[PDB]
Amino acid sequence: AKTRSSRAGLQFPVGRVHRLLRKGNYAERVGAGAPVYLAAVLEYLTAEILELAGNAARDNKKTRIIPRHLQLAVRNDEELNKLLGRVTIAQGGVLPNIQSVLLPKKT
Amino acid sequence: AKTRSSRAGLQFPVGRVHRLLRKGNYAERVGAGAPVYLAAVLEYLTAEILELAGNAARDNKKTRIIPRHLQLAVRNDEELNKLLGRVTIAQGGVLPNIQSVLLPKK
Amino acid sequence: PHRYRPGTVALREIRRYQKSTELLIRKLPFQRLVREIAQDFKTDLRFQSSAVMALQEASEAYLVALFEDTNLCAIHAKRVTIMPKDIQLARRIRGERA
Amino acid sequence: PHRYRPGTVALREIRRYQKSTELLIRKLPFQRLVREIAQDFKTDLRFQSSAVMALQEASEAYLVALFEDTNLCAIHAKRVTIMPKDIQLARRIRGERA
Amino acid sequence: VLRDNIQGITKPAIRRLARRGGVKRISGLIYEETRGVLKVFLENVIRDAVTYTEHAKRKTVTAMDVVYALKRQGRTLYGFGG
Amino acid sequence: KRHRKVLRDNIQGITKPAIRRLARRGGVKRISGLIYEETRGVLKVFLENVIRDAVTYTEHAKRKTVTAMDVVYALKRQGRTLYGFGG
Amino acid sequence: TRKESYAIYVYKVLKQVHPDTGISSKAMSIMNSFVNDVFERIAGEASRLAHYNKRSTITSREIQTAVRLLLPGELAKHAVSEGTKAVTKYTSAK
Amino acid sequence: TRKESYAIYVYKVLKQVHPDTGISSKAMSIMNSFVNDVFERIAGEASRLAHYNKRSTITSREIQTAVRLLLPGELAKHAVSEGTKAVTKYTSAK
DNA sequence: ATCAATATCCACCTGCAGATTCTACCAAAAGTGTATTTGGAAACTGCTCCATCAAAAGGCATGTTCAGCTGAATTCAGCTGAACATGCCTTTTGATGGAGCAGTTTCCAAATACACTTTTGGTAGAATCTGCAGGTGGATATTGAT
DNA sequence: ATCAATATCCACCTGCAGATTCTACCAAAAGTGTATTTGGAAACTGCTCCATCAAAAGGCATGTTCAGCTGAATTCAGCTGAACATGCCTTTTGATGGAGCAGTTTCCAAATACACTTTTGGTAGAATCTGCAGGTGGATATTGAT
Ligand SMILES: [Mn+2]
Ligand SMILES: [Mn+2]
Ligand SMILES: [Mn+2]
Ligand SMILES: [Mn+2]
Ligand SMILES: [Mn+2]
Ligand SMILES: [Mn+2]
Ligand SMILES: [Mn+2]
Ligand SMILES: [Mn+2]
Ligand SMILES: [Mn+2]
Ligand SMILES: [Mn+2]
Ligand SMILES: [Mn+2]
Ligand SMILES: [Mn+2]
Ligand SMILES: [Mn+2]
């Protein structure tokens, strides 16, 4: 036998996603390709966020991704920042950003 | 046969509300009292706005409620204004309001 | 030659437009703008008439409320003249820029 | 005796806190405020410890983001000092009081 | 004389909008700024409306496509169906 | 169960230095003396609103314990989605 | 193909509240939008409530909690009393 | 009662992009919230979409449109390619 | 521009909480295999209502003049930041009773599932009815110069 | 204070776009009756984890002193916008072929429904691993007085 995830070439669980779609009461019926397409998208978005967060971790000389790295990744990326524009990542802190007029001296 | 609306003492259609709830994919099942309770809530809110809207038509010397009156009724009512805080009533205009600092120094 | 002082007529217009509800952008030019923008997303589209009107009612209500916030920002800076930086501040705080 | 000029340490504090992520309000005092408020809504409630931490993470993120907007409002008025009117303008534009 | 479409949103039309918004005095630079803001607003709403149009396999943008677009953008509009 | 101390004035537990720290994370360099009380008032409203909804979810489920999920759902309802606590 | 709306019921309510007041087409369309909007918000909130509590059924209780979550203070209190009253009346009837 | 999470799948993907990078439990909890959040957002947009079109079925076509409505520019483009590819492959394997 | 008082950078190194490492159990999943059902793509088509043209119609573009607004320059009272002394109360580490959340089984009140009879809201066409939008007249207020 | 130019009201009037009244048609609903199915309440209870008391101590909150420099006030002149008069081009309005939005009919690919069979994600418990928090020391900037 073979998982629907293997037939679709995915890491994310097509079976699980199909089930969650049915239990969520989104529609009377859910076609076979729906969970495949959805699992694929979720997998792609998670690959994207982990790619950037692992880079933030590397930048900070860390080998383990922590919430701060997820936040730096999201907030420093225009599109992920927008997609998560109303989301708060716990223990994420904020991006270093001091308004110019507040700096001392001149020039 | 007596309509579920009449049994509940409502003007709004219980039967239709039950149907809309079932086909809206909100839950696998919908109990009998849900559409009655919900219809009553929709009726009450409707009466509240029409009550204040009608009053606004009256203050404006009008017998027919138009969008402007619904807007005046909603925006002048603290609670309705918040309920409809992210809603735009077409052809509603805005409440007369000029920031004090903009008025001439009489 | 009679002449109203600067501001007297402005105030008169505020009172007048806050009393009415008609759209303030002319229809055809708005429609052209709408079609042109849509053509970039999908060519050869038609629009129901009510579709353009809904877009205009929504667009005008959006700009009018944005002007209200813009005005509060100019007043916050002790001015009575709205400037681009006032619209920018309002949009940023609304999270349209943020 | 050495003294940094006013503003120097403030800037140092900004860099320090924008670099870290730990919560800034003391934990027990925040937990008591949560319990006091909840108690006035409904008596005899219990709280999972993570429910109180969730409220704290959300409350601090909310306040930090509001101070950012407040700061922009003060700067808009040519000030570097935030004042109650800046918080009020920020909340009004956000639709928290509008 | 030609005319860029967004320029069809004229200075007077913008001033009227501003008046209904309670505005007494306007900087000359406001007009272009407003046009830019309005274009972004329309691009965002129209993009979604057209996405609903195409999903429905239609060639005509309906009021409902617009209502649904406005609603998902947090700009719910009453009066045009839905 | 005997007694249970009265809770009062705990908004004062949100101290001047804690508020200063929160403003520093928010990039603020100088703060008027009136800001502290103003911030407490704003935090109280924020908390009353989220806690009201969270407890509403708690009561609906017929529980006496406010869960992290009751708070996550309350935050989500308010457009303040929070990640990290099961939500 | 039939196009259903709440228009006729909104009108019956109007007559109860303001017997000699009419309502224009545009205004009625606004009221129809209002009813559909509140119906969806209340229903969606009730839906989430049942799912959160792993219940397959949306009953009057989820409608009630949805109302308390969605409507501002006094509006919620009167809506709840109106809803409770209608289910009582309804339940007591052959 | 067993409580599911996307944790093992997030981990598999983490290993593909950054082989020698790990993830703390709190970050994994954030990733699990993210996946559930986007799943619900896309599923809800798909649901409404189907309802708006009087369809009782959510197919990959509704998921694709929901994705376009929900995701910013470049992310939507890439998500669309990945989902399309996954379905074409899926359908070729049986 | 030199020089001191201090913050900041940071690579290295030890103890430890949190994390990735296995063993065994498995119910809940997920998948493989026939039967039965049906949602909606596809094709054809009628009826809207949309795009486009002509002309009757109601602003907008443009240059002139100057009122009054914005913002620069100046001043200073006193707020608010920085530093400091003192010691309170939060934090940390642990233990314990037990409130109550959550698992398991029983079992009916209430919901789904048709099948059938009745009523009802929506649509189409015909024709009469009506609130009020503009248009007029004269009165009076508002505004601004003198 | 005194007109004088205009804007603003209000009382009245009435044609008409749009709201109301009525007859007729009927698929769509909605209500009633019958039988089966089932979600989730009460009942009992295992067991997590919440509230609470204890003790110790140092990370911080509090309260004060002192004065740097910020906000707030005042003054003033350049110049940008408001008001307005002058003149035509883009918009609005009303009339007319078809682009397709929909209503209808046909039909199968594909989605429930259902019984097994097999695979797998959790997770309870014990065991060993491993990234980095946290403290240390010292060389390198940063600040601020002079
Ligand atoms: Mn109390
Ligand atoms: Mn069929
Ligand atoms: Mn017990
Ligand atoms: Mn009838
Ligand atoms: Mn009139
Ligand atoms: Mn006259
Ligand atoms: Mn059961
Ligand atoms: Mn002390
Ligand atoms: Mn200053
Ligand atoms: Mn100029
Ligand atoms: Mn054709
Ligand atoms: Mn396994
Ligand atoms: Mn370290």
- CATH code for the domain of D89: 1.10.20.10
SS (H, E, C) chain E: CCCCHHHHCCHHHHHHHHHHCCCCEECCCHHHHHHHHHHHHHHHHHHHHHHHHHHCCCCEECHHHHHHHHHHCCCEEECCCC
Can you say whether the dihedral through the CA atoms of A28, A34, A40, A41 is positive or negative?
A: negative
Check CB contact under 8 Å for A26 and B26: no
Residues of A in contact with B25 (CB under 8 A): 25-28
C-alpha distance from residue F59 to each of B34, D19, D42, D43, E51 (Å): 19, 40, 9, 11, 41
**DSSP-assigned beta bridge partners for residue F82:** A88
Burial of F4 (0-12, 13-18, 19+ CB in 10 A): exposed
Q: Are F22 and D63 in contact (CB under 8 A)?
A: yes
Kindly identify which residue of chain C lies nearest to residue B92, measuring between CA atoms.
C21
Nearest ligand to the CA atom of B62? 5
- Return the closest-CA partner of residue H40 out of F47, E14, F72: F72
- Return the closest-CA partner of residue A19 out of H4, H62, H38, H10: H4
> What range defines the domain where residue C73 resides?
1-98
Taking the Cβ of residue E76 and every Cβ of chain C, the question of whether any pair is shorter than 8 Å is answered with: no
d(CA C26, CA E16): 11
**DSSP-assigned beta bridge partners for residue E26:** C82
**Overall number of domains in chain F:** 1
Residue nearest to nucleotide I120 (CA to C1'): B3
Q: How far is the CA of H31 from the C1' of I56 (A)?
A: 65
Number of C-beta neighbours around residue B51 at 10 A: 16
The CA B22 to ligand 7 mean position distance, Å, reads 21
d(CA B80, CA G75): 8
C-alpha distance from residue B96 to each of B67, B83, D92, H35 (Å): 16, 21, 18, 47
Minimal C-alpha gap between H70 and chain E (Å): 9
C-alpha distance from residue G48 to each of A16, B27, B32, E3, H31 (Å): 20, 9, 19, 51, 22
Taking the Cβ of residue E57 and every Cβ of chain H, the question of whether any pair is shorter than 8 Å is answered with: no
Minimal C-alpha gap between G60 and chain B (Å): 4
d(CA G69, CA G46): 10
Q: Are C51 and E68 in contact (CB under 8 A)?
A: no
Check CB contact under 8 Å for G47 and A24: no
Minimal C-alpha gap between G31 and chain E (Å): 8
Number of C-beta neighbours around residue A77 at 10 A: 17
Can you say whether the dihedral through the CA atoms of C60, C63, C69, C70 is positive or negative?
A: negative
Spell out the residues 6+ positions from residue D88 whose beta carbon is closer than 8 angstroms to its own.
D97, F38
Instruction: Judge whether residue G2 contacts strand I, using its CB and a 7 Å cut-off.
Output: yes
Instruction: Judge whether residue D17 contacts strand I, using its CB and a 7 Å cut-off.
Output: no
List of C residues 20-49 with CB within 7 A of strand I: 26, 46-49
d(CA C69, CA C95): 13
d(CA H69, CA E72): 9
d(CA B12, CA F81): 35
The CATH number for F36's domain is: 1.10.20.10
Q: Are B60 and B69 in contact (CB under 8 A)?
A: yes
Experimental method: X-ray
Residues with CB in 5 Å of ion ligand 1? D 40
Q: Are B36 and B10 in contact (CB under 8 A)?
A: yes
C-alpha distance from residue F73 to each of D32, D75, E36 (Å): 22, 36, 37
Check CB contact under 8 Å for H27 and A41: no
**Overall number of domains in chain B:** 1
Q: Are A7 and H90 in contact (CB under 8 A)?
A: yes
Instruction: Judge whether residue H7 contacts strand J, using its CB and a 7 Å cut-off.
Output: yes
Angle of the D49-76 helix axis to the D27-41 helix axis, nearest 10: 100
Instruction: Judge whether residue H57 contacts strand I, using its CB and a 7 Å cut-off.
Output: yes
Tokens matching residue D35: 């319990």
Instruction: Judge whether residue D76 contacts strand I, using its CB and a 7 Å cut-off.
Output: no
Q: Which candidate from E76, E79, E81 shows the least CB-CB separation from G26?
A: E79
The CATH number for G80's domain is: 1.10.20.10
**Overall number of domains in chain D:** 1
Residues of G in contact with E77 (CB under 8 A): 33
The set of strand I positions with any atom below 7 Å of a protein CB reads 5-8, 11, 18-20, 28-32, 39-41, 49-51, 59-61, 67-71, 79-84, 89-91, 99-104, 110-112, 118-123, 131-133, 143-145
d(CA D47, CA F68): 8
Residues of A in contact with H52 (CB under 8 A): none
Residue nearest to nucleotide I27 (CA to C1'): H2
The set of strand J positions with any atom below 7 Å of a protein CB reads 5-8, 18-20, 28-32, 39-41, 49-52, 60-62, 68-72, 80-85, 89-92, 99-104, 110-112, 118-123, 131-133, 143-145
Nearest nucleotide to B22, CA against C1' atoms: I112
Nearest nucleotide to C83, CA against C1' atoms: I70
> What range defines the domain where residue A41 resides?
1-107
> What range defines the domain where residue H81 resides?
1-94
**Overall number of domains in chain H:** 1
Q: Map tokens 């219980």 to a residue.
A: B14
**DSSP-assigned beta bridge partners for residue C15:** none
d(CA F67, CA A98): 37
